[PDB]
Design an enzyme around this catalytic site. Structure first.
Site, PDB file in Angstrom:
ATOM      1  N   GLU A   1      -2.346  -4.778  13.484  1.00 41.59           N
ATOM      2  CA  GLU A   1      -1.300  -5.577  14.145  1.00 41.59           C
ATOM      3  C   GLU A   1      -1.789  -6.298  15.387  1.00 41.59           C
ATOM      4  O   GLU A   1      -1.335  -7.414  15.654  1.00 41.59           O
ATOM      5  CB  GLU A   1      -0.080  -4.706  14.470  1.00 41.59           C
TER       6      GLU A   1
ATOM      7  N   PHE B   1       0.816  -1.218   0.000  1.00 42.33           N
ATOM      8  CA  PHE B   1       0.000   0.000   0.000  1.00 42.33           C
ATOM      9  C   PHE B   1       0.844   1.259   0.000  1.00 42.33           C
ATOM     10  O   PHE B   1       1.796   1.413   0.782  1.00 42.33           O
ATOM     11  CB  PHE B   1      -0.935   0.021   1.250  1.00 42.33           C
TER      12      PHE B   1
ATOM     13  N   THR C   1       3.118  -5.678  23.530  1.00 37.87           N
ATOM     14  CA  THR C   1       2.040  -4.697  23.385  1.00 37.87           C
ATOM     15  C   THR C   1       0.788  -5.281  22.695  1.00 37.87           C
ATOM     16  O   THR C   1       0.200  -4.643  21.814  1.00 37.87           O
ATOM     17  CB  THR C   1       2.524  -3.448  22.664  1.00 37.87           C
TER      18      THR C   1
END
Ligand SMILES: CCCCCCO[C@@H]1O[C@H](CO)[C@H](O)[C@H](O)[C@H]1O[C@@H]1O[C@@H](C)[C@@H](O)[C@@H](O)[C@@H]1O
Ligand SMILES: CCCCCCO[C@@H]1O[C@H](CO)[C@H](O)[C@H](O)[C@H]1O[C@@H]1O[C@@H](C)[C@@H](O)[C@@H](O)[C@@H]1O
Lengths: 273, 273
Positions: free
Chosen positions: A231, A52, A173
């Site tokens: 993600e 992209f 995370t």
């Protein structure tokens, strides 16, 4: 003829080269590229690469494609699919034999967060990919510096995030709110995978991108955005559907941020400073 | 919940755990059985095990089956197929739930050398294996001592011969006459695999056993018998069609001959003295 593998000699003494579910972790020294190239060329393997390049990121396409031609899947059949809001601004890069490029226009903030997974989902389902065997999905703000080839190919792969390969799982995370479809509890998780490089067979990339897109739609209906967007969903997906290869951070690195540690013998695909 | 894999810690420092074509080599410490058991139980995996017990070898079936019940694929669906010239002499061993045994009678010296590959070829093609996902083909003069489970399962696997895992390829007892279909040149070969333990999906075992049987028929027409019979053909096959897992000699050992070296953490399946 190639060097005989030696059963009594570890391929690496400094890093883990197989996951606990027996998926290879791809580091330099773990594979012989000549044998792999032979296996894949015997199947006339075609690799699609999706990228992209939106708004000012269209500026990164020239070096991305010039370096892909030097280092990505050289000798195999490759088709680049560039998704962009500026199709007219795609650079005309000269390609090696057996390699082609198509330009796919993107239209039209949470829907932009969903765009990559939505668009790859829709695209991966199209009949014009009948000839394509694998899809590799990467970010454009990168350059190839070294070999990235068929060693990566497998039904489903993710890539170890370069910031976290040394971290314990509680430091990952991951999305931590039970309200989100991406939720992963404190005590769970194998690796932290980066959204900038994942792929697999066409069928496995249809499944991954459909699951991530549908999960993100559910979160949006509930008024929640996962902490690291697609993600976070990628990690939840790969936790439940374990990848059949994992790429080391040789395949996704930032040298300005992280330098060149002894465990990396090659820097293959790197952030542009 | 299971222990987090550690990227910076090799799973073994003393042995090679992945081949140069990125197939895992299965040693203790390389896999977490709980994760594998989950993946395979989610597919309701059924394992067929074939074993030949001819003439006086029918005496080894009692301990072979008693120990398989303790150690082979426990918790998964198993069907033993015992090929024997004495069906009446098969011991009545009590089996765990989800496990069954069938007896297949063999009829009728080069045709005996061909019997294993011929018979498994014919058998693997039968419609009554519709429910069976993998076939494991082992010798009867053996006992199970320790876990042998779904870690081994893959489309195609061979097993490192316990006498040769440390040898260089020119010392491998491959067929060396160019007149034989099993011929492997001096400078070629990855590993020496033993004919006593190989397997894979049903489709890959059909292909392997058909290729070996057809190759041995060609040799017989030419008046040549490969030096180690169907093992020589197995090695030629696995050289050209590389296995997607390789089992370490933990899976095929002779303790009377070779003792218990430091590189073997478990002795799983062993010769009966
Ligand atoms: C100066 C910024 C340093 C950030 C390092 C951690 O990387 C980021 O990690 C999160 C998850 O915790 C996301 O994956 C995010 O995209 C990552 O940042 C990007 O990748 C790093 C490696 C670096 O190139 C950053 O400049 C990117 O923004
Ligand atoms: C006293 C015999 C020792 C032989 C060791 C080498 O093993 C043999 O290797 C050939 C190929 O070179 C064949 O694979 C043969 O079947 C092997 O012998 C058998 O396996 C060994 C490990 C041992 O158990 C022998 O008693 C078997 O006859």
């Amino acid at each position: 003829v190639y060097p005989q593998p030696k059963v009594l000699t570890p391929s690496r003494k400094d890093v883990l080269v197989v996951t606990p579910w027996l998926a290879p972790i791809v580091w330099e020294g773990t594979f012989n590229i000549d044998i792999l190239n032979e296996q894949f060329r015997l199947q006339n393997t075609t690799i699609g690469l999706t990228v992209f390049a939106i708004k000012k990121y269209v500026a990164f396409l020239k070096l991305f494609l010039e370096t892909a031609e030097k280092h990505f899947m050289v000798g195999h059949r490759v088709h680049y699919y560039v998704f962009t809001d500026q199709p007219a601004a795609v650079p005309r890069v000269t390609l090696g034999t057996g390699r082609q490029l198509s330009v796919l226009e993107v239209g039209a903030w949470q829907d932009v967060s969903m765009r990559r997974m939505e668009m790859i989902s829709d695209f991966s389902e199209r009949r014009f990919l009948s000839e394509v065997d694998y899809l590799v999905c990467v970010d454009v703000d990168m350059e190839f510096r070294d070999h990235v080839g068929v060693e990566i190919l497998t039904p489903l792969f993710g890539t170890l995030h370069p910031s976290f390969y040394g971290s314990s799982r509680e430091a990952f995370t991951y999305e931590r709110r039970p309200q989100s479809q991406a939720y992963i509890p404190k005590d769970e998780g194998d690796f932290y995978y980066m959204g900038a490089f994942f792929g697999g067979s066409v069928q496995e990339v249809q499944r991954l991108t459909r699951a991530c897109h549908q999960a993100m739609m559910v979160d949006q209906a509930n008024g929640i955005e996962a902490v690291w967007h697609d993600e976070s969903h990628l990690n939840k997906y790969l936790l439940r559907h374990k990848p059949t290869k994992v790429l080391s951070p040789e395949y996704l690195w930032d040298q300005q941020l992280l330098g060149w540690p002894a465990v990396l013998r090659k820097l293959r695909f790197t952030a542009v400073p």
